[PDB]
Amino acid sequence: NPSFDWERLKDVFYRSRAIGELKWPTQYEEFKCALSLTVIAVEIQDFIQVYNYFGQLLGKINLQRIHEDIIKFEFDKDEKLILVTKSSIKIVKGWSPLTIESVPLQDPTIDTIWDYHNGIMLLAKSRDIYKLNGNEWELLYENKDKKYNLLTKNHWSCNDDSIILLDVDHVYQVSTSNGALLKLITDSSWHKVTISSRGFICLYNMKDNKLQIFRDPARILMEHNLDSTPDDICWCGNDTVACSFEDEIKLYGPDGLYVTFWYPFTVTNLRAEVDGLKVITTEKIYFLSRVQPQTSNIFRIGSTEPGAMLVDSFSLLEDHAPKAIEILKNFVLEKGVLDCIAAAIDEFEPKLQKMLLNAASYGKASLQYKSFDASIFVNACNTIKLLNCFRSFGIFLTVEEYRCISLKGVIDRLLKYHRYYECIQICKLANERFLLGYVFTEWAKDKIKGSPDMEDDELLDKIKSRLSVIDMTDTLQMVAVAKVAYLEGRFQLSRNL
Amino acid sequence: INSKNLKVEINTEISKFNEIYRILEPGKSCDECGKFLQIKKFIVFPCGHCFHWNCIIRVILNSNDYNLRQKTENFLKAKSKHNLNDLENIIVEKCGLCSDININKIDQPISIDETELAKWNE
Amino acid sequence: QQYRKFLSEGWSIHTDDCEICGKKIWGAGLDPLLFLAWENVQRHQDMISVDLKTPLVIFKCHHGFHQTCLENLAQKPDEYSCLI
């Protein structure tokens, strides 16, 4: 029974799943590891390696010397790995056909760079805010030589809207919509600040160790005092702050409750994705999360409501059948079947899903003739298939994360890494036609812009034989393909296309 | 006594279930095939499902299940239908979409790879 | 087991029409009005408004009957019984 893993803080449980085992011999993790969305970037001496969560190699970059000694590398919302240099910012587009692009300062005369976070820069002296535009900088509030006395980078953290910057005397928030300064506190000495996606705040003190989570000023949601010193204070995603102590994670909550999450080896760099707390170890990967109420009673040891007894009815079936039949006369067959259907949607092992689905199927025959819609069962059984197929090529995601970004967001991430056959197979099983030609146009553009020592007739023959498979008319515009063919020496092929 | 009571209740339920179908067809109807329900046959199941007596037999042939697939293969759908009661009993057993046919397909071991990756890839 | 196995199976129709107004509902030869009515729905959902508001009733006898046709015999729509 899966109830062994669950622990219990006040009124709720926290799951601890396990997926992905990445292998590095002794210390190939080293330091300076970038991690956003199952694209891990790690260096050792002179090479940059990018891997998935399954250990397979994906690409290699930083060969030869580009000068301007690198300080940091960060990912973003579109996985376009940004590299920050001393005098400019580099962005990488193509891995094998290298297409590194650079954006310098508007006036590289006095002061170049202090640091750079999501969509925000900071220069060394005269601390001023620059918003990252498409390929240029946008000015914001200007310092009057009275802003801050900050000593290191740990005194500021960006967010989608707020750009709260920690200080030593007064925290000064800035509205990025108009770049307007605004004082937030009058007496504090916080040294570390973390922010959530929804806008929650967390403030450390590193003296009389304590935390103070904020939703609005003058209101305190929690005064949970802390002992010793943390290392990688992080977030679980609009739920609760998280702290770790080497080989331990101490999840917290109201009234100073503690949760222990002992792990075998250690805890390396940590992320705070939406509703997730993806933990990277030196050998494996974990997906610390929280239970949900609909699935919190079927598997919970000891239950009375509809559910957790329909499963009991199915398990009892095939032996003492009269008892199983007689069980279905005490609980209404409405909530139980609904929970059973919307319980296997967010499961991981492909064994509990089968049991939940067949139990839910044995929940409709005894129900009323025409009282319950049958579309929910079909929708769930169809949405399981896409996630199961996705968890085959390397990319792993949950049902909630799949709602945040459309299927095109998933298709782009795999079209980026020169895998033009995998993508075309999701579209077939997902039963879609709108996003079909978007793969073909990218593949044709890359093929045309690839091998230059080709022949026109054979290239056209291949590019038109590959079009025979696709039978669909949407976003199949080849005018761009003809233009990019015309953009270089090949003119006859461009005319013939 | 409990077994006798259960048997009596089961017999009463079975007797009541006979000739009490009272299933209804909606103004215009169709499913699975897509074209139109009222063109080939009326293989209808509970919980509002419709089949053409042909799409369903196509599904079982394409289904990953082995024993059921070969069991229907004795008639080959062409050898001899006899009284057609055997085919009627074999075909009408599952809902088509709400049964084990689609439940046992959520793992997808099928991955068509025939070295064609060298063509439509890389 | 026998009772459980007899609550999910469906049923087909062997006859071609009802036995009180002739016509046909299964074999080729439907009235074109029904085909046009199906075209009105599931294509643009403009307006389904026509005298063809009779839902077919399927029975264990497989004969099949309409609803208004059976309503003509002063039969309440709660005791539908086949005429054998």
Numbering used by the authors:
A (entry chain B): 3 to 499
B (entry chain C): 797 to 918
C (entry chain F): 1181 to 1264
Sentences from the paper on this structure:
The hexameric HOPS and CORVET are evolutionarily conserved tethering complexes within the endolysosomal system of eukaryotic cells. Early endosome fusion is promoted by the Rab5 GTPase and its effector, the hexameric CORVET tethering complex, which is homologous to the lysosomal HOPS. Vps11 and Vps18 form the central core to which Vps33 and Vps16 are attached as an SM module to promote SNARE assembly. The two unique subunits determine the respective Rab specificity of the tethering complexes.
CORVET was produced in yeast cells and isolated via a FLAG tag on Vps8 using affinity chromatography followed by size exclusion chromatography (SEC) with high purity. From 33882 micrographs, 219391 selected particles provided a consensus map with 4.6 Å resolution. Local refinements further improved the resolution to 3.8 Å (SNARE-binding module). CORVET and HOPS share strong structural homology. Their respective cores, consisting of identical subunits (Vps11 and Vps18), are virtually indistinguishable from each other. Vps3 and Vps8 are specific to CORVET and located at the distal ends of the complex. Similarly, to the analogous subunit Vps39 in HOPS, the C-terminal α-helix of Vps3 is anchored to CORVET’s core through an interaction with the RING finger domain and the long α-helix located at the C-terminus of Vps11. In contrast, the CORVET subunit Vps3 lacks any further C-terminal extensions after the long α-helix, thus significantly reducing the contact area in the Vps3-Vps11 interface. Vps8 exhibits a characteristic elbow configuration, which turns its N-terminal half towards the β-propeller of Vps11. Moreover, a hairpin protruding from the Vps8 RING finger domain is sandwiched in a hydrophobic groove between Vps33 and Vps18, clamping the SNARE-binding unit from both sides together with the C-terminus of Vps18. In addition to the C-terminal interaction with Vps18, and distinctive from HOPS, the α-solenoid of Vps8 has two additional interfaces with Vps11.
